[PDB]
Amino acid sequence: FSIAVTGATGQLGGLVIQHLLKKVPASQIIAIVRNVEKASTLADQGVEVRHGDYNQPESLQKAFAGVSKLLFISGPHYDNTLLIVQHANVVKAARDAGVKHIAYTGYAFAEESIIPLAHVHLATEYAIRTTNIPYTFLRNALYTDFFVNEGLRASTESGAIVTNAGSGIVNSVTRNELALAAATVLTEEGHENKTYNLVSNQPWTFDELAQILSEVSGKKVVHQPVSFEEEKNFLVNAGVPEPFTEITAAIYDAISKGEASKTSDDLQKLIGSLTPLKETVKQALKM
Amino acid sequence: FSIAVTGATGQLGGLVIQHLLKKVPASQIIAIVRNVEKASTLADQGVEVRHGDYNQPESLQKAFAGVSKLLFISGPHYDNTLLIVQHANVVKAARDAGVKHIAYTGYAFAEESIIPLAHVHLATEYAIRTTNIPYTFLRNALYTDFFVNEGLRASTESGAIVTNAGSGIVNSVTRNELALAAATVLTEEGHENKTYNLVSNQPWTFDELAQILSEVSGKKVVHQPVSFEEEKNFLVNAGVPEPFTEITAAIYDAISKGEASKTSDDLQKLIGSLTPLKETVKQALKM
């Protein structure tokens, strides 16, 4: 029976579907999406598309009708209090539709977290627990892709990666590997009523990232450590709009305080060997 | 400035208002209610009544308009998954209205609890945390009134209190004392960003309750211990409808497993001496 993926046109959701397509027939996968025009790509691959908007309880009732396994990918997180309402609507719709298994993309080590979004994930986990639906909490790390992407070309150019993270440790993993973990979990037995903290057991620092970028690119790049307020200003000056520049500085600050410093073998046990940071840097730069 | 109480026509809410009326002028209190006709009694006392229905986000936006301190009393708990949605609507309405302080009636020791409703309370606490509003989590014990009420006359008549609680320990406190604690907290400094586990530090067993009922009434009453299924059937046979009889047996079963067996001095520190169980038995029976 069927596997449905919310957030299916998003980056993580699209990768989950691409991994599911290597495991199950396309007819067995259901893409649940807010913008049905966006999901054209998917329909061509033989994946059924349904409209499901977290702001619209009725739309979710219909989208979840008859689905056996649901991958509930968390919403974009501008307004955390709104996100709780949206997530609560999703869980109730899932309960009402008689969904037989629910997997939820949470946040690793949320109980120890110092960023506000951890609260949303824990509230959502408790909401799913009230349903009595067999669950899997896929507690994802921060995305390596947030830090390691084509944007690093700017750092190759300037000779510096500028952050306020200090020597904060980073347990990030790529969206690709987190998507693979979600797909693996959805398509095999044994993961009912389990929580996984899906993080790297080979963490890195920004010093290390600069050294790897230096190695790959041939240009000397240093990590240049600055204050929170120096970071916010550096980013705005580089054309990052003030809200996102604030979010980025806040994530670096949490990192400087150990936010991403805890590890687990859960991910490696689920999917096998993890992608070395250097390979991700090479891909990001196509170098 | 103003203190608003949701669930104001309910048993706990009405007692909070009666305690607030001994501390602050009636004009400073706002009763927020679903059924405005029910709140006639309150309006006669000079308490402002507003319509606020947890199913109606717009109604809550208007009810919370301009309120400084909000006592969010949890909804009735038939459907736990629906309750999460309702509670999420309340918290968002409170955030949007710019409520300056939120107190929430949660459940003591919820993290260790084995009843499903604990999950709702923890989800709601995490929701309130996302707002950044200064909070007080008034984590209430089970109500002594659930077990000790006029219904005990039936036990005086039969010579038996019949439960499936065994020798399970009970840390219950009366609605009256929990309401007093809520009112105390609302009307003094120092309780911002605090969690209180509001329970008895003089717990009791059903054996003890039968002995106290025997003492007060002059008739020998024993505690007669039965199975879960024997309890459910005993209650239905005594005219308790099958859903409530199931809930009652489930609460006794949780008690037999230590659900209400943990204590704290938080309540006694907040309100002073606690009401002896024997005094509550006398009141319940007017004996």
Ligand SMILES: NC(=O)c1ccc[n+]([C@@H]2O[C@H](COP(=O)([O-])OP(=O)(O)OC[C@H]3O[C@@H](n4cnc5c(N)ncnc54)[C@H](OP(=O)(O)O)[C@@H]3O)[C@@H](O)[C@H]2O)c1
């Ligand atoms: N761990 C991390 O470092 C990290 C970082 C960022 C986010 N996250 C979380 O992980 C999730 C997935 O990551 P991602 O990179 O795949 O995010 P993404 O590409 O931004 O995708 C977010 C998805 O949510 C959908 N969405 C937004 N509002 C919706 C609504 N009202 N109803 C239904 N769907 C809605 C979007 O659909 P549309 O295509 O219609 O816009 C999009 O498909 C995010 O939503 C976020 O909560 C994690």
Ligand SMILES: NC(=O)c1ccc[n+]([C@@H]2O[C@H](COP(=O)([O-])OP(=O)(O)OC[C@H]3O[C@@H](n4cnc5c(N)ncnc54)[C@H](OP(=O)(O)O)[C@@H]3O)[C@@H](O)[C@H]2O)c1
């Ligand atoms: N710790 C315990 O042993 C225990 C036991 C039972 C309940 N509780 C919790 O503590 C709360 C208060 O206890 P209580 O004895 O005062 O309960 P209660 O007398 O049953 O009152 C519940 C209140 O919630 C209101 N309500 C129901 N649906 C609503 C809605 N959709 N929108 C707005 N208000 C709504 C009711 O209003 P109406 O008058 O309009 O019906 C009522 O005033 C309960 O709601 C429950 O969550 C605790």
